[PDB]
């Protein structure tokens, strides 16, 4: 059972408790292209280890085979990292809070070739979160949706529908939070739509990021074996 027995409040509290910690960077003194890529990828690699523990605490995820778990994390890992980054950077307009000791504005994305286009997309998403006044309870719901949805496309004894049952539960949970916040029925549906359309942009940013990360890897500009494997799954 597990997931489907949870109430809307239990879902929220479970997702909140499962949240990973905010890690620090190696930073510092000024940057170079190799140095910048070093800090960012190092950070991502350590966050990845924490993400995996977090995934196993997302309700319904442990009920999946190890094959399906791998496939989902392989597909969604950069989306999960990015929505996290975007969430952390909410209260810092025009800046990306990769870490408490690593706060990068737009211009510093130019330190690495082609990265500024990505920063711009991340920043605009953060500005959108801010504009919507996105709440923490909503954020952890969206991040879980990304995990379960992004690769939900494998004939046998599915399952798959159980993932769609869990997905429906998280939808109910989001609505519950909005109805609790005093939103009218019409406002609930609209806000839900707005939040989920953001997931389309996050997917876009992840695809672009995967292209860029692969471009830097395929030119020897030094990634961990874990990162290389995560990167090899998108090719």
């Amino acid at each position: 059972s597990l997931a489907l027995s949870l109430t809307a409040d239990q879902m929220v509290s479970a997702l909140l408790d499962a949240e990973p910690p905010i890690l620090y960077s190696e930073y510092d003194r000024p940057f170079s292209e190799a140095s910048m890529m070093g800090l960012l990828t190092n950070l991502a690699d350590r966050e990845l280890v924490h993400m995996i523990n977090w995934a196993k605490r997302v309700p319904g995820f442990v009920d999946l085979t190890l094959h399906d778990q791998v496939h989902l994390l392989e597909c969604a890992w950069l989306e999960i990292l990015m929505i996290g980054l975007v969430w952390r950077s909410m209260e810092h307009p025009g800046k990306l809070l990769f870490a408490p000791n690593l706060l990068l504005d737009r211009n510093q994305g130019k330190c690495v070739e082609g990265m500024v286009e990505i920063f711009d997309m991340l920043l605009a998403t953060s500005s959108r979160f801010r504009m919507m006044n996105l709440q923490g309870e909503e954020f952890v719901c969206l991040k879980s949706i990304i995990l379960l949805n992004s690769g939900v496309y494998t004939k046998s004894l599915e399952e798959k529908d159980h993932i769609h049952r869990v997905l429906d539960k998280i939808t109910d949970t989001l609505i519950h939070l909005m109805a609790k916040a005093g939103l009218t029925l019409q406002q609930q549906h609209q806000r839900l739509a707005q939040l989920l359309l953001i997931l389309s942009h996050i997917r876009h940013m992840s695809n672009k990021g995967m292209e860029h990360l692969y471009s830097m890897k395929c030119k020897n500009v030094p990634l961990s074996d874990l990162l290389l494997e995560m990167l090899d799954a998108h090719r």
Binding site: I52, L66, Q69, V70, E229
Partner: peptide, 10 residues
């Protein structure tokens, strides 16, 4: 097997 495989188990 894969690193990701190992991490999910452990």
């Amino acid at each position: 097997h894969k690193i990701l495989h190992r991490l999910l188990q452990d």
